[PDB]
A paper describes a structure:
Typically, TCSs consist of a sensor histidine kinase (HK) and a response regulator (RR).
Our attempts to co-crystallize the DPP derivative with the CA domain of [name] from [name], a class II HK for which robust crystallization protocols have been established, failed. However, we successfully obtained the X-ray crystal structure of the resorcinol fragment bound to [name]-CA with a resolution of 2.1 Å. The crystal binding mode of the resorcinol fragment supports the hypothesis that resorcinol-containing DPP compounds are likely to retain the binding mode observed in [name]. The [name]-CA domain was crystallized by the sitting-drop vapor-diffusion method at 21°C using 0.4 µL of 25 mg/mL [name]-CA protein mixed with 0.4 µL of reservoir solution containing 30% (wt/vol) PEG 8000, 0.6 M ammonium acetate, 0.065 M sodium acetate pH 4.5.
Author numbering: 5 to 141, 154 to 188
Write the structure that this text describes.
């Protein structure tokens, strides 16, 4: 199928979520032509919807907050697909507040998963990996479990005030 069978439902959903959350969102879709196995298109919808929800809820800041921090007033959400080899790569990127890595660390210490000394030398990717720990947080463990049932991989990149990029790699 073209991935557009999934991507064509997101403009309405993002718009309804942005309206519910009183948030101004510039939503852009690219690579909707990208074709992949029907089993993927039937299952990739729900995980991508979760990621779009997360970006709009926890990521994108309200216009007035963006203006106070000197950002472009309306936040941007980009959903993309492309071919890489015999994989498909799907990206959800926002220019919102990003993931607070210091908050992750604090929570991880509170949950007994690491001590303060070990937290000081963690890389950014080991920190962000805490989000995939079942109910660490949102929902990144359940997104992971679906991608994994499709034999895909997922990664997250994030920087404070810069934004967040989640990338899903799928086989075929
Ligand atoms: O902007 C964000 C923040 C948190 C999780 C997410 O998938 C996106």
């Amino acid at each position: 199928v073209p991935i557009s069978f999934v991507f064509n439902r997101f403009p309405r959903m993002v718009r309804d979520l942005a309206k519910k959350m009183n948030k101004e969102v510039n939503f852009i879709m690219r690579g909707e032509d990208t074709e992949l196995d029907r089993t993927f298109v039937e299952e990739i919808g729900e995980p991508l919807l979760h990621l779009l929800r997360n970006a709009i809820d926890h990521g994108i800041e309200p216009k007035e907050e963006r203006i106070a921090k000197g950002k472009p007033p309306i936040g941007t959400l980009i959903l993309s697909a492309r071919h890489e080899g015999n994989n498909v790569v799907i990206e959800v990127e926002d220019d919102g507040r990003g993931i607070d890595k210091e908050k992750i660390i604090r929570k991880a210490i509170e949950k007994g998963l690491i001590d303060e000394s070990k937290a000081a030398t963690l890389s950014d990717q080991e920190i962000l990996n805490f989000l995939f720990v079942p109910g660490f947080s949102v929902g990144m463990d359940v997104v992971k479990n679906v991608v994994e049932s499709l034999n895909g991989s997922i990664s997250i990149e994030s920087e404070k005030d810069k934004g967040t990029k989640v990338t899903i790699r799928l086989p075929l």
